[PDB]
């Protein structure tokens, strides 16, 4: 029983009749309507259902018997009641918003506010810090991009062959020869053979990143879609040679060599080693029964394989071509070459972007968009947005970053903006 709801009870039953004239709800806060000779068990009494109705604020239960019906008035002008009828009556009746005392307000101050504020004051606070000196200058020019590309090239260097990027071109072998070469290479590396499949077993790791270098561009990528589809298929079909119309791959699971009792099947997190074939004439040459081909491997994370295998090469190429300028011919190292360069190498670059699972080319593209839209930039700071080597690690992402920078350089050289 609280005296703060009296008025609220009064408006709850203005002139509501139950039998012919008699008011349905008796208010316990008025002597005339209050029921004498009976204990009061709620704010109001309903005679048709012979029940007690009590009003409570949001999160403020009142001490009334469990039988008493509780009608909650939420802070967002919404009411709740176990009985739909009383809910509707209160909803229509309480349209005139009359604030009731005891409603918790966001500005409420607890008895421990001062203590917590003192604790906060005694705790450490930050220092001011220096105000930056911002100089606005013109965006980077062709010379700066060339400088960044040259720095990357001299810091990391180039590989002798294109490695797995060469797998986007025909290897010059038929299906049977390709399968034989892949199987014999797997046997040569002493891969475990089990249930008709290959498994690569490892014991210890040097715990250091693999050598990073820039991959030279093959002439073209005729089999980009085939290779991506093969990887997508290999996401789950690992251990046996997968065949396409013009090329094949072998994705072998990589498992720990625990001992006699060792893992026998791939799990969700098991990595893959994807082995592909390309034309011979590099360090990674393999020969068997007179069949020669370059065998190139790629250690793929299951998320990496899933991401790579789902890319749509053809649609991306067409969308880019919709509103593209003329692509110039380029050399093996992404340099303008109008004499012996090839325009097909751009396809290869796109394929590289599909193979790179970190998509650093996206960051380079965003920064280049800012560069093309910018009238002025911060001196010596905007230029440090193309330096993304620290953000990536690996031969494929490094090559993708280098060739994105080369594409920016070529755009500035051929179609200045």
């Amino acid at each position: 029983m609280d005296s703060r709801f009296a008025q609220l009870t009064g408006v709850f039953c203005d002139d509501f009749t139950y039998s012919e004239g008699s008011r349905r709800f008796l208010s316990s806060y008025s002597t005339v309507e209050r029921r004498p000779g009976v204990p009061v068990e709620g704010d109001c009494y309903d005679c048709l259902k012979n029940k007690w109705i009590a009003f409570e604020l949001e999160g403020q239960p009142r001490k009334f018997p469990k039988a008493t019906v509780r009608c909650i008035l939420n802070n967002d002008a919404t009411y709740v009641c176990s009985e739909q009828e009383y809910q509707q009556i209160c909803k229509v009746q309480f349209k005139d918003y009359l604030e009731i005392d005891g409603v918790v307000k966001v500005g409420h101050k607890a008895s421990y506010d001062a203590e917590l504020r003192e604790r906060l004051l005694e705790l450490p606070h930050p220092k001011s810090g220096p105000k930056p000196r911002i100089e606005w200058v013109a965006p980077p020019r062709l010379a700066d991009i060339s400088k960044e590309t040259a720095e990357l090239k001299r810091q990391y260097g180039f590989f002798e062959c294109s490695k797995f990027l060469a797998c986007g071109e025909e290897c010059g072998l038929d299906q049977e020869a390709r399968e034989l070469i892949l199987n014999e290479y797997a046997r040569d590396r002493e891969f475990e053979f089990r249930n008709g499949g290959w498994i690569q077993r490892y014991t210890v790791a040097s715990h250091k990143p693999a050598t990073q270098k820039i991959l030279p561009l093959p002439a073209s990528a005729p089999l980009a879609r085939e290779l991506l589809m093969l990887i997508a298929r290999s996401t789950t079909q690992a251990g046996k040679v997968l065949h396409s119309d013009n090329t094949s791959i072998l994705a072998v699971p990589v498992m720990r060599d625990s001992g006699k009792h060792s893992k026998r099947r791939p799990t969700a997190s098991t990595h893959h080693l994807v082995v592909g074939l390309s034309k011979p004439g590099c360090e990674h040459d393999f020969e068997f029964d007179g069949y020669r081909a370059a065998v190139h491997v790629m250690h793929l994370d299951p998320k990496q394989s899933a991401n790579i295998g789902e890319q749509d090469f053809v649609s991306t190429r067409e969308i880019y071509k919709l509103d593209m300028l003329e692509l110039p011919p380029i050399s093996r190292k992404g340099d303008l070459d109008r004499a012996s360069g090839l325009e097909t190498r751009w396809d290869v670059i796109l394929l590289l972007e599909c193979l790179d699972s970190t998509r650093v080319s996206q960051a380079v593209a965003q920064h280049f968009n800012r560069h093309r839209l910018a009238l002025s930039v911060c001196k010596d700071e905007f230029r440090k947005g193309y330096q993304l080597a620290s953000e990536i690690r690996g031969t494929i992402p490094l090559s993708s970053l280098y060739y994105s920078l080369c594409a920016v350089r070529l755009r500035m050289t051929v179609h200045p903006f």
Binding site: S19, R24, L48, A232, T235
Partner: protein
Amino acid sequence: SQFGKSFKGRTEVTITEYRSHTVKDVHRSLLTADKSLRKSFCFRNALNQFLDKDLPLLPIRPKLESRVAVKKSKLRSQLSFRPGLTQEEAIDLYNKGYDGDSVSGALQDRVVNEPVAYSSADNDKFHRGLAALGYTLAKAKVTVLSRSKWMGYEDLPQKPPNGTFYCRKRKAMLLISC
């Protein structure tokens, strides 16, 4: 007695919490969508079933024909306002046996804002994607508490002063406020 374990120490919990404890969590499959669809020929069987059974029962829709000339303009936000149901028809729909959750969702008004840079002479609203082509789209607060006879309730008289009664013309309980 899972209620005593999930909500140990509490005898009453809000409907929001209880429903949140029956969401039937969805597990992120470790396979790609393609491999999942291939697994057990689930998609192939679903396609066979859809072609054999579901497809014939499709309510063929009419084809759009209305068109108006348009010209490229600045970017605008075309606004589609779908009103939500009201208490009366919501109660009627629930009573008729329709899913309560769907009606609860439909009670909320829907606003769709779509960026389009295309205008007509009369500033018509266009269909999804067909903006370039120009396909155009063109007292007492008596409250119904329920559509059923609540037992032991007074009948509605000619002049119901302020109470709650039952209406014979319309099979509904009427609350006559004010």
